[PDB]
Each structure stands twice: as structure tokens, then as C-alpha cells.
Amino acid sequence: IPRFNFEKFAGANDRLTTQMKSVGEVMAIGRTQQESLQKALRGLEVGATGFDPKVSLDDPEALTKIRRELKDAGADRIWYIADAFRAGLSVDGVFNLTNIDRWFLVQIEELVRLEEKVAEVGITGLNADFLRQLKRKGFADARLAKLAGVREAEIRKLRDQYDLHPVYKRVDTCAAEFATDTAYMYSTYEEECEANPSTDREKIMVLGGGPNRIGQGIEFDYCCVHASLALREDGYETIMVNCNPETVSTDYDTSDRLYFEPVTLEDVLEIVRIEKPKGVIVQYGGQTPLKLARALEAAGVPVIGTSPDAIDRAEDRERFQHAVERLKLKQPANATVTAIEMAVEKAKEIGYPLVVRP
Amino acid sequence: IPRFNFEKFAGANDRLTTQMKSVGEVMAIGRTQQESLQKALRGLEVGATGFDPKVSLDDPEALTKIRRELKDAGADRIWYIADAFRAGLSVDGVFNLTNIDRWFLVQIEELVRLEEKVAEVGITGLNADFLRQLKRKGFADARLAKLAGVREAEIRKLRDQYDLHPVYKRVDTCAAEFATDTAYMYSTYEEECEANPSTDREKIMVLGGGPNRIGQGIEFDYCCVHASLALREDGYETIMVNCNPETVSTDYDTSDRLYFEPVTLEDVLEIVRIEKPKGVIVQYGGQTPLKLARALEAAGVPVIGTSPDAIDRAEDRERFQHAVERLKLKQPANATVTAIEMAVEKAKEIGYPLVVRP
Amino acid sequence: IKSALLVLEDGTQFHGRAIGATGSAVGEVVFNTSMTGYQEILTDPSYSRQIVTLTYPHIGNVGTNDADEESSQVHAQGLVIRDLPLIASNFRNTEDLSSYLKRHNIVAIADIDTRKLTRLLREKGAQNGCIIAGDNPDAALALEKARAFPGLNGMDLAKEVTTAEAYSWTQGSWTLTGGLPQAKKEDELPFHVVAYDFGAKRNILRMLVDRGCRLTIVPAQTSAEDVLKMNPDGIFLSNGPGDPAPCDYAITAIQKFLETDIPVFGICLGHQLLALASGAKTVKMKFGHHGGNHPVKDVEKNVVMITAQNHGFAVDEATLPANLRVTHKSLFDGTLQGIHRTDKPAFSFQGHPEASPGPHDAAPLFDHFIELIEQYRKT
Amino acid sequence: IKSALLVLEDGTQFHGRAIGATGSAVGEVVFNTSMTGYQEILTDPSYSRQIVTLTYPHIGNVGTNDADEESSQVHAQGLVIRDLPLIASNFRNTEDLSSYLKRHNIVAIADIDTRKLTRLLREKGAQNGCIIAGDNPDAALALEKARAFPGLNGMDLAKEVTTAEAYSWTQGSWTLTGGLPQAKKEDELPFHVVAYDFGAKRNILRMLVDRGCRLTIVPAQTSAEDVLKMNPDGIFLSNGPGDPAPCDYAITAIQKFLETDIPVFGICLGHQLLALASGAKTVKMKFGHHGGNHPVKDVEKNVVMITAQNHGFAVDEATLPANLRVTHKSLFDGTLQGIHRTDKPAFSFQGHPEASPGPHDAAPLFDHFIELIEQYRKT
Numbered sequence A, B: 001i002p003r004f005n006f007e008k009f010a011g012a013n014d015r016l017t018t019q020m021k022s023v024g025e026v027m028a029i030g031r032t033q034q035e036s037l038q039k040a041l042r043g044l045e046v047g048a049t050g051f052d053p054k055v056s057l058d059d060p061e062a063l064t065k066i067r068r069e070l071k072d073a074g075a076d077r078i079w080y081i082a083d084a085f086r087a088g089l090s091v092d093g094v095f096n097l098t099n100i101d102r103w104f105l106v107q108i109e110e111l112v113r114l115e116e117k118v119a120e121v122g123i124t125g126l127n128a129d130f131l132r133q134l135k136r137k138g139f140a141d142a143r144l145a146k147l148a149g150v151r152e153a154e155i156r157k158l159r160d161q162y163d164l165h166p167v168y169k170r171v172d173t174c175a176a177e178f179a180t181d182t183a184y185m186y187s188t189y190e191e192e193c194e195a196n197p198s199t200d201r202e203k204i205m206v207l208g209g210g211p212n213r214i215g216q217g218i219e220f221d222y223c224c225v226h227a228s229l230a231l232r233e234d235g236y237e238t239i240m241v242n243c244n245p246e247t248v249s250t251d252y253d254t255s256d257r258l259y260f261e262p263v264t265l266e267d268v269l270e271i272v273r274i275e276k277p278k279g280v281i282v283q284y285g286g287q288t289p290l291k292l293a294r295a296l297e298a299a300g301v302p303v304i305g306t307s308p309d310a311i312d313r314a315e316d317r318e319r320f321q322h323a324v325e326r327l328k329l330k331q332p333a334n335a336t337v338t339a340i341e342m343a344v345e346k347a348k349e350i351g352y353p354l355v356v357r358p
Numbered sequence C, D: 001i002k003s004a005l006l007v008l009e010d011g012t013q014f015h016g017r018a019i020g021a022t023g024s025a026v027g028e029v030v031f032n033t034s035m036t037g038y039q040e041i042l043t044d045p046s047y048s049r050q051i052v053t054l055t056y057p058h059i060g061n062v063g064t065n066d067a068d069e070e071s072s073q074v075h076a077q078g079l080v081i082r083d084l085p086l087i088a089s090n091f092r093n094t095e096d097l098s099s100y101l102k103r104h105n106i107v108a109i110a111d112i113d114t115r116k117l118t119r120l121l122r123e124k125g126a127q128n129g130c131i132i133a134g135d136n137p138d139a140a141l142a143l144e145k146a147r148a149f150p151g152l153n154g155m156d157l158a159k160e161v162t163t164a165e166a167y168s169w170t171q172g173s174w175t176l177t178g179g180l181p182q183a184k185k186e187d188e189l190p191f192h193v194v195a196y197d198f199g200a201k202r203n204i205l206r207m208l209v210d211r212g213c214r215l216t217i218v219p220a221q222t223s224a225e226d227v228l229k230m231n232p233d234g235i236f237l238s239n240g241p242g243d244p245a246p247c248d249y250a251i252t253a254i255q256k257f258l259e260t261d262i263p264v265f266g267i268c269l270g271h272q273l274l275a276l277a278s279g280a281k282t283v284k285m286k287f288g289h290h291g292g293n294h295p296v297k298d299v300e301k302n303v304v305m306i307t308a309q310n311h312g313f314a315v316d317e318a319t320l321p322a323n324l325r326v327t328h329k330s331l332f333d334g335t336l337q338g339i340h341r342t343d344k345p346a347f348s349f350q351g352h353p354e355a356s357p358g359p360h361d362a363a364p365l366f367d368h369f370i371e372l373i374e375q376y377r378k379t
């Protein structure tokens, strides 16, 4: 799935055409196209958990906007396609506007219908059999959680309860015709697990930054790669977690073990679950792994290096402002404003010109 | 089907609710739901030929108006349903907004698809088989003409060509379990014809006005009934053509033969075809039969009384005026005007106040 | 294009569309005016060897469901309709008509002028026919099958549809709220009625169970001796297909029951055997009665009941032994609809008190049987 | 729940969903890596008595079509897949997969870990298994049926799938443009090739024709005696199921042709026979070769071809008679892939030059044959 950054070029024509406009891409592997597709959506670093809604059901103009987005594809097409089905448009209807093969269309309609059920049955309705069916089709714990009106963690717990965990298949070039000595794996909900983790070494996991985006480029991947090269050389068993098909990080040669997965709490927690690593590095892949830091810790992940809290201290404007203060360092004068006139007054205090952020 | 008159009540809320707002109703009989419904649409006297489109397919906002029309019914809902299917909406889509049982919905979608086929193949694709199938579904020659881009007469001519005519079934209260001496008929495209028209008597056909509407009320039905009564008494075999369920005109007792049909050129010609009446009366049913005069006459119909042409001389603003001047009578000063500035002057001539008919 | 074709003895042909299984069907052709209840109708054993035509155009609007089956299978030999709707649309549906039919291996045709056919049947009477569904239906072939069909007059079909071995019945009527109930316990029902299965309809049994009767359904050919040995509280004569006349073993057994004082009650076929068993004669109707709007008069009370009918044969009222009294007549044609033994605790009814598709107007006929029993017991 | 279950000899079970006929299926369980061409694989006689597992998850994406059938029926015992798509989406589809299955009354299961299966068969070699598809599939039963299975070793399957009568074939190959062509006129074809029907694939025949060959298909047990009478321009040995070993008549016959100067050429089974008829020995492969991405080298030319493979038994390189020269070898396992008679105009190929689902790489193998013919004619 391509990765766009249209929000950084507002004046730009954001319709997809023959001239590339994407700044990156993500890839996912699934035993099924549905599973494959959803895994990519949640690994895109756009805040999707899958087919998150773009329009409101009760919006009277919705069909009109959906229609538009379908006929003239933009970076958001995918989501609109799902909204079309929630809005009552048929597969044939959608095909006609998009020219996307029905073969794919039907599959997305089925994910919609499935979601509607999750929304109707709620959490009570999430029995093992059904939950499994949902996982098998690539639904993220997070997507489910929203439909069920619960916390992502709740779905995750429910999964634990049921012993509903993905297994790992390996990439081999031959559809299992021949054995493999490489540890290039992907998650899926099936029977046999091919992870066969080692009890032998002290493992170090490196978290990738997912698809590239403006501001989150190759520089991070570069770091990731080095982390792996160095520690593996040092004697550790290096585990890389990433889904950018364009990188060196995602080369099986780059590490001892490669988990070609979405860099998400869910997906990461699962690997850890079975890997039981010695430490995890969340500081080298950009914003992506950074945002997971706290959460991971919370869940018991053995996060190495600068602490999630330490990171927050730096990231939190307020938290920061205090260490500075304490340190007796110099910062430009600031102020957090709520209201318009509040700012206009508070501004006289700070003095123009000003840097207004939201 | 109810008949509304919202156009005469400009500032009135036109959404349908629990307080009635219709002024009349039409009824239809068909061997199947589709045929029955289509027959009803074409006899509604609202200018429809079946499911004529309300919004343009190229209209980008169309899905918005459609949605609205479905969710909050107006008198035109029935037509927006079809437009919704033409627009890519699904049966469930439509269900959800209208609460109209899918049992009914699917049949409408079905006709939409058939319409799409007619539009695609055109007249050339209207083979005997296909054409028969369409008639059996209630399609009006006039609707088929619209879809194939031809004149209704061509569809007609083509039917005649294939000896493709309807048969008449009779009402009997018992699903034909018992014989009937009554002649209360309806057309359909089936095998056996129960018409069994007489050779014996002199026939006079009386044309009703369809549903009641403001300006076209009971008053016309009364005249129609009177003509039947009077002539039947007189020794003529009276034949009544009408489709308003509320009237005496549609009471089997009122005439010798009752054709409970749409008061259309199509329907009426089919009857004339087998009845070979002595005369047809078109001046008693109001505007409906009146508008058919010329076409009937043109098609060989023995229209009795004041000629379609004479009627036209009076109804025709110019024809009339001539006669008036010819009789040296007194009319009010008038003028036709095309323009918006033209008027202002002609106005000046005529003298205020003015009557402005558009 | 799935062709199907119906050909009558008379050579009349009806060209339409296959909606059920492929193959051929041969039987007597009938028409049923029931605007509702097609499943029930199809599952009615009385229809064995008959090709059923429905007068109501849309057949299958509400799909089908188990609760709506009046026997273990579809007894109808074939189905003839005008329109098979696009979809089934009912909360109760579990399978669309077509599938159901396909499942039951029933040859069925749609899209024909059922009115023309009804009119023909009404006017010229019953006719045997053949339905051929398949690629290239052979008309001449169908004519032959229809022609070669032996006919139902004098055809014992109760023996063909009856239960192999006797069995117990203790399940009650269905309800909207709970569906079909759970079978009662033998100790939950006061009476013991032995129901001869001449091709019994589930509803009759259920309705009896409704009145406190534990049943024992016995094969049609079951001996009266064998029956008495059971010391029944009531004997019930079920409904069923074919001619009742050639069912010697039922008339005889019944005659036996009539020597006794045990309460006997018959419905439809049971009504005819009862009559035969009483010395009455039966005749086969011109086209019979098949529908759910048939007005029957309770001559005694002078009241009308709208009924559910399904019979091709009738009891001749002018050959009625004096021990037989007239209780109900058809308001449509005057044909005998009910009789009562003057001398004994036995009576029957031509129509269907259990209905199953149809009005519940005749259900009280059931109550009379109940009294009889209660009185028998007292003695 | 429309349950399906597959059990292996080893008692390993895979519980999925039924997607074809209701019933049971027993055979040798194999795996095919072919990403496209499922219908052609299905209709491959060679698959007789075999339960076909497809490694590529989505099976059915393009539906089915007549043109894509390699035989008159479906030879596969059963079908095991990971996922059956909601729809078929291809302009050439005439029926969805499930439908096709049920039609060919094929037991098929979906939704199982096919990968788990493949790695099992690869690791532990082929296994006989059973698929049961119905309401309540009896695991115990399945295992039982699977274990009871004779096995394909020493199983002449050739005889079972061969034509009853001989017959002519003059139909050429399919084109995107004119689909399947009209069979040619005899005069139209220069050569006359006699083809022993060992369970022959339609493509082989079409491809031969394409090279001006009028054919005469013959049953498996036809006598060389009978055959030679025909004055054949060339003799061809088709592919086919089971063991070739036990095909005595075949072997015998061939040896007979091996005395003559007639150009002979075999494919797959026909390849093993020739070998056997030459003094070679055949072996049953651990799990064999089924796929369409198999690299095979023309040892002579030192060129690689990607090929379509379908065989569970091979010709042992080490036991080859001197009169037999190696021509092709597999790049995956180096197993024997082609042989040529040093002393005669006879040769064969283990893979499928005609492919049919698969790469057109081995096509020229046909050419050599032609050349031989033309050369034999000159004489």
C-alpha cells in the first residue's frame, strides 16, 4: 500500500494519476488476501486500524462524497470504498466508479458486513469461534475494540483468555516444497507455527519505522540496520521487526530473524510473547516505535536504552519546560492558550513575532 | 397507488405522514406484482410511463437527493427507488432507508436492470422473445420507446408485428374455481383470453379519467356513468374503461363490460382492437381521455361526438380566438409573449391588470 | 435457460421454467386456491401421486421452514406455479422454495398460465399429467407418461404412505412465542388414542395432543384385534391420498370398532372409510376440493365455517344408511361434509379441522371427539 | 456449519469446510504448487485415486470453463484448499468452483492449514488420507478409510482410466481469439500417430495435432500386433495415473515396437514405460513432483526449462541400460527427467511438454518427435 503525505502540500492536487505522488510504502503478508490487506492497513502509519470510517452514516451528503472519492481516487480511496458498502452501495455500484476488480471488492464488502455484526453483538458476542474468524480475516484488536466499544487491551485479554494467538509462517520461495534455514516470518491465524525460537541466546529486537514518510525516512532505517549489524556481530541474536519492502532492514540478511510485520503494539507484543527477548530497541525507527514505547513497557516489554518516561519528559512540552527550568537553561518564552483573545494578550507578554502551533 | 396534488399547494409540507394528503388513487390488476405495479404507474395520470427517472445519472449530487427522498418520503418516492438502483444502491441500502420490504424492492431493482438492457440493445435488440418478456413485466410501449429512443408507435407497431398482444382475464372472487357470467376484465400477457367479445350488439366505449385529482373529480365519473346507464338502457352494449377503485364507474353493475385498465392509448387501443366498438366517448372523463382523442382517432378509433378537432379548436388559444373574431364576439385583450421585455410593452397595450398564464 | 414442460392426458401443453429437480413427474393434476400455506400443502401426504398447481401467482414469498412441514417429506408429485418470486422474505424462512424443492427432489415448473389450467380442470375435470424438466423436454414423451398413468380412481395410496411400524405421538401445537413444543411425557396426557395412519398430517396429531391425547400411530393395515388389545380411549382415522374404497383392511377393521362402544373419529379419508364402514358408497369428484376458503355448513347448528379442503373423492349422500346422519354440507356444491352414526359414538368430517394451511374455524370438531372419550371412560 | 474433515494415515486431522459434494474421499494425498491452473489440474487423469492439495491459498478466483478441462471428467479423488473466494472474476468463467465440484460430485474441503499439510508430506512423504464432508464427519471413520486404502504402489491405474474403444482425434490447440478450434479433416493432417491412452491429457493431443498429426487413440492394453497393422507414422505414450510397473501389457507392447524402426515417444507414465521396456527400473518418489515452477536441464544443451510436473514415481538413473542415455535432469533434486534410446528413435520426458496448467518451455520436445517421424517417412 502506498504512503502519501498530501497533508504537507495542501495546495497540491491530491488526486491519484500516472505521475507518482506517494512518498513511501508498506507491505504485508497474509495467508489470505483479507488478512494480507488488513495487516497492511494497520501497518501504514496513518492511524488506521483497518477500515476505519471516513464519513458519518447519518451524514446526508455522505453518499455524495463517497461517490466522489471513488470516481476520482485520492489517497483515501480505500477507506471510502468501505464506507460505500456501509452506506448501501453495491459491489457493482462501486466497480463502476472505480474499475477495481470485483474479486477484491467482494472481500472488502464481507469485512464490512462482519464489522456490522461485531458492532451489533458487541463484546458479549465475541466468542472464541467468532473472534477467531475475525482474527483470521485480519481484524486488528484495535479495530474490534472500537466496534465493540471497548479498549484495545480488552480484546487483547479476550484473546489471551481464549488462547487465540497467531502462528508464524516462513518465506521460502517455494510454497514449502523445500525446507528453509532462513527465519523470514509473517503472522497468521493458522495451526502450525514455524517460529521455533531459540532458548539458546540473548536476543535483541529492533523496531522499524514502517513505511517511509516525509520526516521519517531512510535515516531511521539506517540506524535500525546498524543496531542489528553491531549487536549480531557482538554475539546477540538480532530480531528485526519491520514492513517496509524498500529497505535494507527488511533484507533477511540484515538480522538473525526477520518478522515482516506491522510495527504495532499488537503485532509486536505477539512476537515478544514467543521470543521473550532480552531487550527491545524502540529509539531507532522514528516516530513509529517511539509511540509504542510506553505501552510496550506497561505490557512488560524489556525496553532497553532511554526509558519511555525519559522520552516523554523530553517530548512533553510541559514536562520539558521543567527540566530546563531546573537546569537553568534558556528557552524561548511561551504560553499555552485556550482561547483567541487569551493568546492576543498572552502574546504581548511573549512578544512577536510568534510561532503558533496547534 | 395514491394520487397527490402538492404542486397546487406550494407552501405545504409535502412529506408523507400519518395525516393523509392524497387527493385520489389508481388501482391496477396484473398477474404478477411487477406487471400490476407497472400498470398502476402508467395509469396514475402523472405523466409516468412506468419508472421514469427523476434524477440524472450524471448528477453528482443525485445520490444526496435520492437518499433524502427515500429516507423521508414524498409523493415521488416510488420513482426515486428506481433511480437509487440505477445509481448503484443496493436493495439492503434502500431497505434501510425506507423500511419497504425487500420482497417488493428486489422486483423493482429487477425491472431497473431490464431497463438497462433495453437501453443497451435498443430497438434492434427487441426481439419477439425479449419483447414478450418485457410486456409480461408490465412495461409500457411508451417506456420501452423512451429506453430504445423511439416513438411509442414503433413499439406498438413492432408488437403487432409479432402478434404480441395481451389477453384478458376476468375477476371472479374465486381463482377461477367457479364460472363467471360477469365481464370485469384486466389485461395481461398470458395464454388464454377470456374476453369473448360479442358480435351481436352495437358497442359504445366509455373512457374514464383514472385517479381523482383536484379539478378532475367525481363530477367526470358521474357523466361517464350516466353515459353508460343511458346507453345500456338504450340497447347498446356499453363498455367502460377506467381504473379508479373509488368510483361507481368501476362497479361491475355500471356497464355491460368493464375493462379495469389504465386509461392510456396503449391500453385503450388493445381493447378497441378486439371490441370493435361502434363509438368511443372521450369527452366525459375529463382531461385524461380528452388528451387521447387525437391519437385514438388517428389510429382508426371511432370516436363519437364533438370531434377531436373541434375540441382542439376551442382548446387551442389561437384556433379559438379566430372563431371568436369570426363570430364577432367579445374576448379580453390578449397577447402571446416570448420575452421578459416583450411583455412589458404588450402589457402596456392590453392594459393592467393582467392575467399572466405561463 | 432451464426448460420445463407440462403435458396433460388431453394433449394440452404448458411451456415454462424449471424451478425444482430435473426429471419427470406423473400424476393427477389438481388446482389449489390457497393464497398461503404452500409448504404445508406440499408436505401433505394426501397429495401423493398428484401434481399440484397453485392458483395464487407468487409461490415461495416466504421461503420455507421445518415448522411448516406436515409430514416427513414432500408428497406432492410435482408443483405448478405462475411465479417463483425473486427472494423469500420472512423472518421464519430457512430456505428458498427452489432450494427446498431441489432438496426434496421435486420436479416443479413456473411461468405458466395457471389460470388457463385451472379453468380447464374446472370445466373438463381432473386430468393426469406429466412434467418434464430438463434440457430438451420431450413433449410426446410426457404425453405418453400422462396417458399411461393408471389414474387414482381405485388406487390405494394409504398403504403406500403409511408407517411401517406403530409408534407413539405426544407432541403439541406450535406457537409464535415458543415454536414447536417439546414432546410431552406419557404421564402428562390423560387419553390414549390410537390413530390409524392412512397418511397422517402432523397438525392433526399435534392438535390432539393439544387436547390431552397420547397417541399411537399404527400402520394402516393394523388389525382391529391388535388394536383393541391396546385398550384405547379413542380411535382416530387419519387423512391420506388415493381412493378410500380399495382399502379393504380399513373398512373391515373399522366395522369391527363399530361393534364396540369405543369412540371413533375420522378426518377426510378417515371420514370416507367410516362411511364405507357404515355401508355408504364413495364417488370420485369432478375436480375435487382443494383450497382454504371453502364454506361448510353445520346443518344442525346452521352455521358456516370457512374451511381447508383437500379431497378428490366424496361420500354419496343418497346411499347413506339410516345409521348415518348428515352433519355438514358444502356451501359451494352441496357435497357431503360430515356424518354421524346415529347408533354409535362415531363421526367424521370431510374438511380439515386441523387445517394446517387454513382457517381454524373447524377445530371444534375436535372437541366433540374429546367429549365422547370422556364419556366412554366414565363407562 | 457445513463441515468437512480430512484425516491422514498418520491420524493427523484438518478440520475445515465442505465446498464440493457430500461424501467421503480416499486416496493418496499430494500437493501441487501451481499458482494458476487448478481446473486443468482437476481434470488430469493422472490424478486418479489422488487427493489434491493446492499450496496457493486462493483457489477458484477465475471460476471454471470447458476449455480449461484436460479430460472429460474430474480425475482427482478430492480437493483440499485454504480458501474458496467469495466470487469468481474472469471473462472466461462459466461456473464457479464449488458448483463445478458439486457437479462433478467432488468431495472438497476448504479452510485448512494447507501449509501445515505440505510441510508434512514433504517431511514425512506421501500419505493416504480421507476427506469426509457432511453433517457429522466421523474422524475415527476417516482414519479408518485412510488406513484401509490399498496404496498407489503397484497399482495399475492406467487400465482403469483408459478409453473403452479406440478413436480418432484431429483437434488442435486453443487460441485466445478462436478458443477451441474445429477438429481438422483427416487429409489435412500429414502424419498419423497412434496414441496409447494411459489416461491422456487433451493438450498433448491438441499439441500433436498442431504439428500436423492425425491421431488414433487406443486403449492401454492394445497389442503391438494390432497397432502395427495401422502402419503408424509414430507411436505415442501418454501420461496417466498410478504405477507403471504393473502395466505388463504396456511394457510388452512397447518392447515390441522397440524391435521396429518406428519413432516412439512418451510423456510422464509413457516415459516410465519406455524405460521399463528398455531395462530400466522405476521407483516411487517420497512425495514426487507436482507443480509448475520445476527447473529441468537439457543436459545436452545445458539449458534450463521451467516445467509442469505431475508424478509420484520415477525412473532410476543408476539402473539404466546402456542403450539408454540421460537427456534431462531435475534442478530441484536431480532426479531423472529425460531419456533417449542410443540404439533407437525412441525417447521420453518425465515432465509435460504440453504442460496445460503451466510454462510452455518444454514444448519443443514435441518437435524432436516430429523430426523423427518425418525422417522415418523418408524411409
Ligand SMILES: NCCC[C@H](N)C(=O)O
Residues within 6 Å of the ligand: A170, A178, A179, A180, A181, A194, A195, A196
Ligand atoms: N521453521 C523452523 C525450522 C525450519 C526447518 N528447517 C524446516 O524447513 O522444516
Ligand SMILES: NCCC[C@H](N)C(=O)O
Residues within 6 Å of the ligand: B170, B178, B179, B180, B181, B194, B195, B196
Ligand atoms: N370468459 C367468458 C366467460 C365464460 C364462462 N362462463 C367462464 O367463466 O368460463
Ligand SMILES: [Cl-]
Residues within 6 Å of the ligand: B011, B012, B013
Ligand atoms: Cl403544510
Ligand SMILES: [K+]
Residues within 6 Å of the ligand: C015, C016, C111, C112, C113
Ligand atoms: K410461458
Ligand SMILES: [K+]
Residues within 6 Å of the ligand: D015, D016, D111, D112, D113
Ligand atoms: K480450519
